[PDB]
Amino acid sequence: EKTPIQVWGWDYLMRQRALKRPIAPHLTIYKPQMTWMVSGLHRVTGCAMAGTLLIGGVGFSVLPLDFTTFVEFIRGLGIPWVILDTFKFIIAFPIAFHTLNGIRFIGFDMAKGTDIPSIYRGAYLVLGLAALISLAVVVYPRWERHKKATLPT
Amino acid sequence: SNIAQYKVIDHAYDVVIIGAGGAGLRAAMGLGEAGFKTAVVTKMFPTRSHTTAAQGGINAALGSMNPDDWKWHFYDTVKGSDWLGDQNAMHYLTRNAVEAVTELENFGMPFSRTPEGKIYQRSFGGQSNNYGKGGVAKRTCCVADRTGHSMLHTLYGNSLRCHCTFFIEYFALDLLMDKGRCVGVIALCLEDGTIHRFRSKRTIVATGGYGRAYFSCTTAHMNTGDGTALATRAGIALEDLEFIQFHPTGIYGVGCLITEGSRGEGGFLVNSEGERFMERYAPKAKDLASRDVVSRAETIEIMEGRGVGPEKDHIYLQLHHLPAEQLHQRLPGISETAKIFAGVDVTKEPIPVIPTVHYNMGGIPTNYKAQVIKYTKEGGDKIVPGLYACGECACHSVHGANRLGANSLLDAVVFGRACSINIKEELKPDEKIPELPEGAGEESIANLDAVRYANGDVPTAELRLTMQKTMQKHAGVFRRGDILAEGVKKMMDLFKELKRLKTTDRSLIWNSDLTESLELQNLMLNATQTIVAAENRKESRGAHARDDFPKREDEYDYSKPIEGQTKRPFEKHWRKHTLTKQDPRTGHITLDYRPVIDKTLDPAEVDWIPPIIRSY
Amino acid sequence: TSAAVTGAAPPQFDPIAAEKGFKPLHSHGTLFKIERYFAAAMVPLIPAAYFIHGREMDLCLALALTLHVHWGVWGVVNDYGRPFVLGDTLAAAVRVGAYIFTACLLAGLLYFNEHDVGLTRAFEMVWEL
Amino acid sequence: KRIKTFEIYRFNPEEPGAKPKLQKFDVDLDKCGTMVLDALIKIKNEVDPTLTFRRSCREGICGSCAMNIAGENTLACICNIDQNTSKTTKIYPLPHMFVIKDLVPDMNLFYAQYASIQPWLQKKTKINLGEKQQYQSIKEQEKLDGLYECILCACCSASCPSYWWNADKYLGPAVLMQAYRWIIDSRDDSAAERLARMQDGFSAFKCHTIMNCTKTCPKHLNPARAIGEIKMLLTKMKTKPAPLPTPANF
Ligand SMILES: Cc1cc2nc3c(=O)[nH]c(=O)nc-3n(C[C@H](O)[C@H](O)[C@H](O)COP(=O)(O)OP(=O)(O)OC[C@H]3O[C@@H](n4cnc5c(N)ncnc54)[C@H](O)[C@@H]3O)c2cc1C
Ligand code: HEM
Ligand SMILES: COC1=C(N)C(=O)C(C)=C(C/C=C(\C)CCC=C(C)C)C1=O
Ligand code: SF4
Ligand code: F3S
Ligand code: FES
């Protein structure tokens, strides 16, 4: 159930298709900027994490495989410890970033922080805090394993 | 005609309005809500009209800042017109200012406010209290620095509620005449290259001015005098075209306006000797003298070695002594324009400025009901049936030889409104949408085709450019018979070069090489008429300054007492309107003169104002 | 030449005409409100799951992520799954795909919590690598 | 000779099975004005008069010359040409509009949507037109600052991906900021009807806070703030203040 302009809007689109008028390019030509890039990443992350929770949840239930033999399988590959923690960063960033930026965006919905400099300060803070929080949550367990392996008590 | 074929589409309307500036929209509002099936033909989206560039304000004696009377305003307008203004139309204008500006506020025009919540007003050039005798007036109502922008958007918004029908990006080519009557308009639809004839009982011309006839101007690219040209092609004579307002303060390099409101708010002009020279040229009013006076004062300074900058060829507007909260509050727009186009920070540096073509008090001649007229000595003023004209394209004449600042947005609205009032009173359901004569519009189509496929050797851009330069040179702030005669001969030669015209784009769809060529034709008609009229007027009046004839030539010598003088006969003085008839194929122009109307609409409501020497 | 045809008013939205009849009070305000309140509440929930693990938390994650992802994919579906680009029935399919996506997400999460290690242990375990 | 070079989008609807194309033009900057519009006119005037675009004002007030220049939406007439003659400058129409010819977009939906907000003052109690000024305090009129200035160039809406995908249903930054301009007008009595018009899931709420609109607006306005403002109103988090009462001896 559409508003009158929404109906009109639809007929306009059909009128334009009928005239086989081209559509002016957009994605391919718009300058990359910290406004829509950081919106882009909010959606990619949201969707990536949802995609994972489907392919993880349905995947392991439909397949004879279970999570435990999957973990021990990769453990068995014995891959360099440096890389392993990078995978753990790639997994944490989206949760941190998207969560922080989610508070930002909620701000935006309340008309808070919409001036251009607040916007840009906010984008760096969110990107940065998420870089920190993700790195910290990976570095800390390792840091504490190395302490178990190499210190007195 | 000839080399291609054209789709032709007919319509039927009660009235057709050619223009959606302030004037056309106000008429459209009036007529629409009155029931008339009203069509608005404009060559650009209404909001892009030049009205939207207006800045400093709109006049009405509201008394928001101090007591005021509309008769003081009236006096200021008559004196402003240097007695070439018709006092009936000027009476109508000033009488209605308060109601007119008030309506705008009621439509939602967001005027700047006073601490009492009334419409803030400012001082402007050429305005006084108490019939000249009091102080500088505060009559000029504004939305900061963007009064026309705001007004045009308010008028456009409200037009959408008055059931008009918009033909947007339609370029009118001619009025459709049937034996002295106007029965419609013919136009090219830019979108799909088609040709539309609108039939109507009434047609309103509201097409703006012709600033682009000059090389430097404040006006928009679309200011090409198509309306005045339409009237020429319908065999109607144009009025007072030689009276071309130079605004004191266009930015030096680029022609952009800097509002006279910046002087109303306390700015002033300065020469290379650091002198507020308008103290010298106009001791009372100073920097708020009339525009013709201030622009001349500026030009002399330049001619007399006191010009500013590298070439000492312009002058400074100074605002930096004004509080920065006033500049932002009262002149945010020009603060921005000045930075963008001159690198200038108005809080610290002054703006480089120079007088610049700005406004046309000339136009299509009308009566005070805005009905278009033809004139003869024998017959007098004869109205052209079906045809009204208003706004800058019109000559009512509410401005005579010099238009007062903030009176034009006003005259657009007031006489835009008058068009609707007067048509709803005189038009009866009795009358039916007239039928077109056989072949109607063929000439206009033929011309269109010719220009479309024109394969001569002069590209229109260069022909235009020579016209603009010719005009800047031979019809500027100060004029001389020999320079004028020279100019005229060049202009009529350029008009001959129209036959050698080269265009390139041959499409019917959004062909702006074509419309710009059509525009050149219209410009040339205006420009040629302008110059032969100016050439022939051997006096100095308002904006028309002749170095060989520095006197204002009236029926008496109003600088001495009247008694004992014998009135000079009409043919011997110059207190009369100029009428130019032009044959559009050949270019041949004939002149005639029509008497100024001196009476008001009612001597009981207000007296007339007899000429006196014009000082400030 | 003027051997010509009769014309039509251009296409033009008449907002007075449009007003007549139209009431529809189909207010999406409170759904938008709750969507946002919900995400706000998930802020403390994410770090909570960093510290507290187990079945009951695994269940709070599954319920809240499911709800939040349901509203989320519905938005993205309405952006790229538009009748203008996919035609009207393929559009309706993708819209139905939004709901199918949500249900399978939940079933697969309920399964993982009930018959596998569960959410907070699975993370716990990949972090142990 | 500092020769700047311009790659300009081209489209010719007259051509049989026509298709979009970039064209390169060389311009002698010493023979040209400071602004991008100057270069386009120069080309049209000297090189190719078939090149087609909208323009009217000189000072960036009309809103006609809106286009995409060096990847951003702005007005040509006040966009300074980049002096670096080593780089070229790319010029396209407004993103994701249907093009008529070259840089000229069909603009008619944008205008339709604008008509739909009912952009005129509305009063619950009929008033006699022209008879007296309505009262409005400075503080109240100053709420319109940053709203009334919009020139309807559509740079913002042509920058918003949300509007790119759902222009037919989502009103866009420009139209919504005007919707808001009429909502917070202390003199206007229809703030509720104004919101009822845009209650559905798309009209306003398809704003994904991308912030492109505000980034790109050539008049330094903030349609995002206004949309947040509208979101608050639709969700009843905020309410429009009553008008301050008119003074006794007004
Ligand atoms: C920079 C500037 C600032 C100004 N500031 C002020 C001020 O502060 N106060 C004041 O009183 N005055 C001011 N003026 C003067 C005033 O703005 C104008 O005289 C006034 O707006 C006249 O408008 P109009 O409606 O007659 O025509 P315009 O506003 O120019 O509009 C003319 C209309 O006619 C249409 N048209 C023209 N030719 C054709 C054709 N062939 N086919 C179809 N349509 C056509 C156009 O599309 C347009 O809609 C200013 C002028 C300028 C240039
Ligand atoms: C922990 C706190 C979280 C907050 C505060 C939060 C907040 C938000 C907000 C405000 C939006 C709306 C964006 C928009 O309308 O454009 C959103 C979208 C989304 N979120 Fe989250 N979120 C969180 C966690 C998650 C998680 C764990 C997932 C896991 C899959 C997720 C997936 C999504 C998806 C798919 C969208 C739609 C994206 C879009 O339309 O651009 N979110 N989130
Ligand atoms: C409104 O959703 C979107 C964003 N939030 C965002 O930041 C970006 C960059 C986009 C751009 C869309 C992309 C990359 C998907 C491709 C869709 C096509 C029709 C080609 C978007 O749609
Ligand atoms: S907001 Fe800025 S950009 Fe969007 S229309 Fe108004 S002016 Fe053009
Ligand atoms: S760019 Fe688009 S989605 Fe919202 S904040 Fe601005 S409108
Ligand atoms: S020509 Fe008016 S915005 Fe550029």
Residue numbers in the entry:
A (entry chain C): 34 to 186
B (entry chain A): 30 to 645
C (entry chain D): 28 to 156
D (entry chain B): 33 to 282
Question: Which statements did the authors publish about this structure?
Answer:
The enzymes of the fumarate respiration are anchored in the inner mitochondrial membrane where complex I (NADH-rhodoquinone reductase) acts as a proton pump that is driven by the oxidation of NADH to NAD+ and coupled to the reduction of rhodoquinone (RQ) to rhodoquinol (RQH2), while complex II, serving as a RQH2-fumarate reductase (QFR), transfers electrons from RQH2 to fumarate. In contrast, mammalian complex II catalyzes the reverse reaction in mammalian mitochondria, where it acts as succinate-ubiquinone reductase (SQR) in the aerobic respiratory chain. Since fumarate respiration is the major pathway of energy metabolism during adaptation to a hypoxic environment for many species of parasites including adult A. suum and bacteria inhabiting anaerobic environments as well as some human cancer cells exposed to low nutrition and low oxygen conditions, the pathway is one of the most promising targets of chemotherapy for both parasitic diseases and cancer. In spite of the similarity in amino acid sequences and three-dimensional structures between A. suum QFR and porcine SQR, flutolanil specifically inhibits the enzymatic action of A. suum QFR.
Like bacterial and mitochondrial complex IIs with known structures, which includes SQRs from Escherichia coli, chicken and porcine as well as QFR from E. coli, the structure of A. suum QFR is composed of Fp (chain A), Ip (chain B), CybL (chain C) and CybS (chain D) subunits. Notably, the A. suum QFR is evolutionally more closely related to the bacterial and mitochondrial SQR (including the larval SQR of A. suum) than to bacterial QFR. In contrast to the hydrophilic Fp and Ip subunits, the hydrophobic CybL and CybS subunits consist of three membrane-spanning α-helices that anchor A. suum QFR to the mitochondrial inner membrane. The interface between the CybL and CybS subunits binds a heme b molecule with coordination bonds from two conserved His 131C and His 95D residues. The RQ binding site of A. suum QFR is constructed by Ip, CybL and CybS subunits and is located in the mitochondrial inner membrane near the surface of the matrix side. Five residues of A. suum QFR (Trp 197B, Ser 72C, Gly 73C, Arg 76C, Tyr 107D) form hydrogen bonds with the quinone ring of the bound RQ, whereas Ser 42C, Ile 43C and Arg 46C of porcine SQR, the equivalents of Ser 72C, Gly 73C and Arg 76C in A. suum QFR do not form hydrogen bonds with the quinone ring of the bound UQ. This is probably due to the steric hindrance between the bulky side chain of SQR Ile 43C and the bound UQ, obstructing the formation of hydrogen bonds. In A. suum QFR, Gly 73C occupies the position of SQR’s Ile 43C. Furthermore, while the quinone rings of the bound RQ and UQ forms hydrogen bonds with residues of quinone binding sites, the isoprene tails extend toward the entrances of the quinone binding sites located in the mitochondrial inner membrane and are not in close contact with amino acid residues.
